């Protein structure tokens, strides 16, 4: 729970939905 | 009801990127990506839906003991908002309580329509 082990989350999450590329329909952004 | 969901949080975050707000939401559907399996989540406010909601690992057991799950509705008590170089918003949902659970709630809440970003 330290700020930069929140910091690496968040990064790791957004990418995480950048390549999310193969969803359905309705994930599509 | 509508009444029971926090409309236009989602409109707010978009638009001013606050997280000083707690909004009440309704989880619409819970998709893995995949290392531990990460959440992405469709949330509606009764208003619009957004799909860029990603849970924090730290929740993942909610979601794995299936107290979070497709239209249970929860507050949010702590997020974070990551705005990409294309000008999509991810939020990051850090802290939150189910406040009725999908079984309770049976059923989507309203008609919301999704954030035409």
Redesign the interface.
Known sequence: ?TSSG?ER??????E???Q?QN?SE??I? | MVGQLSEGAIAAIMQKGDTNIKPILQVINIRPITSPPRYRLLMSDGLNTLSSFMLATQLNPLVEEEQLSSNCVCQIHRFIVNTLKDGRRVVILMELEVLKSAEAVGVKIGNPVPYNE
């Not at chain 1, 989350?9 to 957004?14: G, S």
């Open positions: 729970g929140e989350e968040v990064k790791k999450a957004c995480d939905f950048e999310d969803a309705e994930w952004t």
